[PDB]
Every structure is written in structure tokens, then in C-alpha cells.
């Protein structure tokens, strides 16, 4: 406990001295070398990128089983892994799907064994679409949609104010198998800047943990788990906030010295631009500080 309080004071003083600003600006936004993203840049894939300047690296892009319409099995999504005290935290960071990439998104969900989706954007912001509505609406008369080989059913939904929890069912039409998928949408991110309500975002992170609780069925606590799927509009800024926040809170578990810029450097090696603004980075500090205060 005193170890946590000391780490909390250290976090606060880094914020007080402005050192949080300095350390953020010296973290490179993209790989210095081997960051060509050549597959993402192919002309045939341009329609599959929401933003032409946010792309996955070739070595870590999520590869779909190729189809005739999608020869390279390309989707704008990156595998992210960071080990904390022997436990590998696995994530897939992807853009908000477009109308033409909903089939790819659900194929990705199926092939990667994904059971949890963390959507950290509203569907429209500022009069612009940020994510296609790739999952159906609630209501017995229209709660199903088919995207290629996948029929998706919205089964229930709860609204917790800063976020909503939707239960989905996904069916592989070729073979008939079904899987349940949880969809956790943070709806309170402001149009400009970063949220002032830390508690709401902390309760969202807590709900992600609660859904991991719902879906864990392996007796072995060291047994591997499918990655959490995290997406925003570009899949980098608010997406990085969720991933860095979860990893950093997990670092608080053991006696491992906290090194937030080190962890963010490793994340950016795996997907460019994660935690995309200065206020998002300071927000992570504030979340960790509020977390330690509530311990």
C-alpha cells in the first residue's frame, strides 16, 4: 500500500513539473525504419483504409484468410502484445469499420477468436461518420444482420451512462457454429480534448475486466486468451488510451517499476501513433493517479 502511495506521488510530480509533456514529445510517433506498410499502401487496398496516414506495419498486420475479392487478406488492424510479469496482454487495434469492410471486420473477429470488442468512439462525431454501424440494432424485429458468411444478432444491451454493454451472437453460416461476442462502447469521449470525468472512463476499464471475468473459462490462470479487439475511428488515439491504461494498471499489480514512456514506445513499435495527442497521454497519467487514489 505504501508502495502504491509512493508511486502515486511520483506520478503527480511528473505531471506537476511538466515532465509528462517532455517525455511524450520525445516518443517517436512512427517507426524510424521498417515502417513502410507496403501492403496497406497497395492501390487495391486504398478503399479499405479509413485514413490514408494511419496504417498497419507489414510484420504485425492482421492477416485474413485471402479471398478472391481480398487477395492479400488486408484489414487495417495490428496485433499488439506486451508482457507484464510473465502474462502476455494481447490486443488487436483496428480502425472503425467502413460499409465495405464490415465483412472483413467480422471475418477478423471469427479467425482471431475475439470475444470482446472495446469500441472507444461514437458512430458519428462532428457531423462525420467515425465508424460504420457494423452490429445490428436492438429490437426483436431487426436485431440481425448478415455480412458475408457471418450473421450477427444483437441480444441485449445495458446503458451505464458513460458506456453501453451490448451482447452479440455471431454465426458462421458455412458451418453453423455460434460464438457470443461482447461489445463495449464508450460514448462519453468529448468532441474536443480529453474527458474530464475520470470515474466514467475508469468504470469502463472495470467493465472490460468484468467481461473478461464473464468469458474466462480456463482453470489455468496462465492459460492463453484471445486478444481484446480495440477500435476508435483510426484505431490509434483513444484506442491507445485504453491499451496503455490497461497495461499500466496491470503493472501496478506487481512491484515492477512504472515506466509509462517505455511501454508506450513498445506499443508504437507495433502500431503507429498510439495515444495520438498530448491530452490523451496526460489523461493516462490522471487515470493511473485516480486509480491509485481509489485503492
Amino acid at each position: 500500500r505504501a508502495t502504491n502511495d509512493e508511486r502515486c506521488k511520483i506520478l503527480e510530480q511528473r505531471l506537476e513539473q511538466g515532465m509528462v509533456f517532455t517525455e511524450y514529445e520525445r516518443i517517436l510517433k512512427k517507426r524510424l525504419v521498417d515502417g513502410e506498410c507496403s501492403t496497406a499502401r497497395l492501390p487495391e487496398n486504398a478503399e479499405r483504409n479509413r485514413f490514408q496516414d494511419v496504417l498497419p506495419y507489414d510484420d504485425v498486420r492482421v492477416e485474413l484468410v485471402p479471398t478472391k475479392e481480398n487477395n492479400t487478406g488486408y484489414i487495417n488492424a495490428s496485433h499488439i502484445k506486451v508482457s507484464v510479469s510473465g502474462i502476455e496482454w494481447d490486443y488487436i487495434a483496428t480502425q472503425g469499420p467502413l460499409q465495405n469492410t464490415c465483412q472483413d471486420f467480422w471475418q477478423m473477429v471469427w479467425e482471431q477468436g475475439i470475444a470482446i470488442i472495446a469500441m472507444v468512439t461514437a458512430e458519428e462525431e462532428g457531423g462525420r461518420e467515425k465508424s460504420f454501424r457494423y452490429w445490428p440494432r436492438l429490437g426483436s424485429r431487426h436485431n440481425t444482420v448478415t455480412y458475408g458468411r457471418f450473421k450477427i444478432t444483437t441480444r441485449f444491451r445495458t446503458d451505464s451512462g458513460c458506456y453501453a454493454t451490448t451482447g452479440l451472437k455471431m454465426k458462421h453460416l458455412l458451418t453453423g457454429q455460434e460464438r457470443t461476442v461482447w461489445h463495449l462502447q464508450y460514448t462519453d469521449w468529448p468532441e474536443h480534448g480529453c474527458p474530464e470525468d475520470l470515474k466514467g472512463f475508469l468504470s469502463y476499464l472495470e467493465e472490460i475486466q468484468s467481461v473478461r471475468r464473464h468469458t474466462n473459462s480456463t482453470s489455468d490462470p496462465q492459460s492463453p486468451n484471445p486478444p481484446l479487439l480495440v477500435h476508435s475511428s483510426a484505431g490509434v488515439g483513444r484506442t491507445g488510451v485504453v491499451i496503455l491504461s490497461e497495461i499500466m494498471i496491470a503493472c501496478l499489480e506487481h512491484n515492477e517499476v512504472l515506466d509509462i514512456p517505455r511501454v508506450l514506445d513498445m506499443l508504437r513499435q507495433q502500431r503507429m501513433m498510439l495515444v495520438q495527442t498530448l491530452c490523451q497521454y496526460t489523461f493516462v497519467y490522471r487515470v493511473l493517479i485516480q486509480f491509485l487514489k481509489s485503492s
Binding site: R50, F51, Q52, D53, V54, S233, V236, G237, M273, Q276
Partner: peptide
Amino acid sequence: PQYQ
């Protein structure tokens, strides 16, 4: 085109 560009995320900003």
C-alpha cells in the same frame, strides 16, 4: 483523408 488525414487523421489529425
